[PDB]
Amino acid sequence: DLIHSTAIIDPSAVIASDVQIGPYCIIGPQVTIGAGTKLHSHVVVGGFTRIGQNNEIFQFASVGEVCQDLKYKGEETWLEIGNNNLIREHCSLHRGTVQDNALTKIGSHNLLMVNTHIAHDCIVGDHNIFANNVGVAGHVHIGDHVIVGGNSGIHQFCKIDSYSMIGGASLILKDVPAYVMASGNPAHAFGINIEGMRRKGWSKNTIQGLREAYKLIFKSGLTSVQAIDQIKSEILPSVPEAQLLIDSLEQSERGIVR
Amino acid sequence: DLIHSTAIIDPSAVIASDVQIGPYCIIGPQVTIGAGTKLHSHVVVGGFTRIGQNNEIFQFASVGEVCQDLKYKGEETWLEIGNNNLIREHCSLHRGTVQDNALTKIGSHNLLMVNTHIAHDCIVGDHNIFANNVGVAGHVHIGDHVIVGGNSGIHQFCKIDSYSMIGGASLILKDVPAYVMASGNPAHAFGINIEGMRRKGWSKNTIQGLREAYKLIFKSGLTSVQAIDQIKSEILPSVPEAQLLIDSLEQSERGIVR
Amino acid sequence: DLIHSTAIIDPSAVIASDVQIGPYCIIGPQVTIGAGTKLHSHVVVGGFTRIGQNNEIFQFASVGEVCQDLKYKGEETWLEIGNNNLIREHCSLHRGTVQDNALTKIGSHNLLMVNTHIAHDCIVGDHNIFANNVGVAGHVHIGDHVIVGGNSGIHQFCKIDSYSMIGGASLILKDVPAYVMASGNPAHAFGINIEGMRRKGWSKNTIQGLREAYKLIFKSGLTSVQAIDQIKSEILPSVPEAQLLIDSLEQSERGIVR
Known about the structure:
The structure is a homotrimer of 258-residue chains. Chain A folds into 2 domains: 1-191, UDP N-Acetylglucosamine Acyltransferase, domain 1, CATH 2.160.10; 192-258, Udp N-acetylglucosamine O-acyltransferase, C-terminal domain (Udp N-acetylglucosamine O-acyltransferase, Domain 2). Chain A contains 4 helices and 27 strands. Chain A has helices spanning 194-199, 204-218, 224-234, 243-251; strands spanning 8-9, 14-15, 20-21, 26-27, 31-33, 38-39, 44-45, 49-51, 56-57, 62-65, 78-81, 86-87, 92-94, 103-106, 111-112, 117-118, 123-124, 129-130, 135-136, 141-142, 147-148, 153-154, 159-160, 165-166, 171-172, 180-184, 187-192. In chain A, the strands form 3 sheets. Chain A has a 10-stranded mixed β-sheet with strand order 3-6-9-12-15-18-21-24-26-27. Chain A has a 9-stranded parallel β-sheet with strand order 1-4-7-10-13-16-19-22-25, with no helix packed on it. In chain A, strands 2-5-8-11-14-17-20-23 form an 8-stranded parallel β-sheet, with no helix packed on it. In chain A, a hairpin with a 2-residue loop joins strand 26 and strand 27. Chain A is elongated and about 65 Å long. The termini of chain A are far apart. Chain A binds chain B through residues 6, 8, 24, 26, 42, 44, 60, 62, 65, 68, 70, 90, 92, 115, 117, 133, 135, 137, 151, 153, 155, 169, 171, 185, and chain B through 6, 22-24, 40-42, 58-60, 88-90, 111, 113-115, 132-133, 150-151, 168-169, 184-185.
């Protein structure tokens, strides 16, 4: 049978068609599991979690457990997971806090390798890869097509925007703008994800515009606002892809990694 | 029922009033669990462990398992945990070795975030916070009100004294004195926990004394013993809080982080 | 009984004499477990795994699970584990990929401390120690008598040769030759494992030869091939132990750590 008899499923849970749940899983209250999702053995879904379609969750993952924030006082909060994600062994995904929006959210087509931690109130987009032992702290926002190298940590409230790459064993304390390669402890920007955007099939002119934008942001001594003005003036009109960089700088709360 | 029927509890275990134990927990021999403690599902308490009152232990924690020291030869040794601790998913807490005192000990009101490791023979005090993926190696002594940032490691035999703060992703190879902020890989002292002690409600004169003590220890070129003499002479009489710094330097075995 | 009634064992598994399997273990298809091996509670052996004799595997280890490589397309691949290994809590050992040789292999007498990850297609020899939270990425080859310090990461395709030592919290991006001490993030060579080879009972003349070889490789400005020529000419004839260093340099694919 698709659901092993030793799984324990709260009466308030709702399980869609063709869901697989292996031995010794625990499904808590107010959990919904979408069609085609597979849980291996030994998965705990704590409660208050909506899981989409065609996910796969491996043994010893702790999914939708209460957060670690000492401010938390038992309020009703949630975790949402989209579709087609891979959540490997030993991951921990925590529910939100009322101080933010009571919601931790992950999108679709993500790979969370062994021991990925997604803290309370994170918002993660689509097509991301978190390598082993990645720790994403509270209220972090991750875009799409991001790669986070193994054993890296992302500090609370940071924003890691689309197509960026974080090198292995990095400590990220500030925002990483769209397309940026950042690495280290301490953690510096090193350039644009040129190979990544070439592999995505982007033109030389587009790439050159983003390289000029990078120089304006990181090498020229300009403030974020000043760099935005230059990108808007000279680069954005022929390189619409530069808008993601502008968005990074406009949306930043912690400042950016340099 | 407060104890799930699928828990397996050794006949020599002793369980106090109002203890909760979730599905698929294993409670080994010579375990005592104090009143009000809650184990979620999938907790293993290996054996020879005394747990106090009002603790909470989450799924996939390995509590009171035999240590990893290759010198260990099956001797009877113990783990003790005090009261009101939070032990999150994937933690590992190991029993002691006869070469020391056959005891790993943690106090009360601690938060051990996901994947905290407490090795054999550690002694940990009260009100500490270990962020995700912290590794505390053998025979480490941690005081009270310490914060250890995520993905940090503390080398065997080190002493991390009260009110200190270890930055994220640090490698601590020597002692961290009371009140000291230390971070990095390699891991340096950077100052006194001023904000921490201000938030604890300490006076400016007290703070200034500790800053002078810091300068004597770290900036003056004096040895630990020489710095102690200066702190005793000039600072300790009006700043009794400086005694914790003196204790750090007097008790050090590995020397101190600089 | 040696096998707990709550273990779930695939009909195609083969279990040798005196095997112990604790509560709530899952043994998947095409698993073989050799004589004297002990699994604690809560071990998952995913499938397609051969385990030798006298191993010990602790709770929440994920052993012989499908790999994390996005290229993997459901092909039949394997994990092999030799004899007398210690696999601690929260380890993850993954099966191979057809792009290599469809096999992850670990030898004998290894200690894998808590949360050791061995990725697809790794080949690990004998008598190695992986400290807590070590991540070994895909296709890595580890020799014998290696020590990997806690919270270190080894990049895909690297080769870590016999008697080498990796310091705690290192990021290894290139090969570490035989006898070499390497540490850091970024990760440099710092010398020969002198104490290690003294403790193995090696002569002063042997040690001096290896130190000269180290200088040729790391300090002289010579290429790997040029250093090999010098070691062959002047050192190898009286110091046969230098052959392991030559092998490291000849076998390197990623180049070596400096």
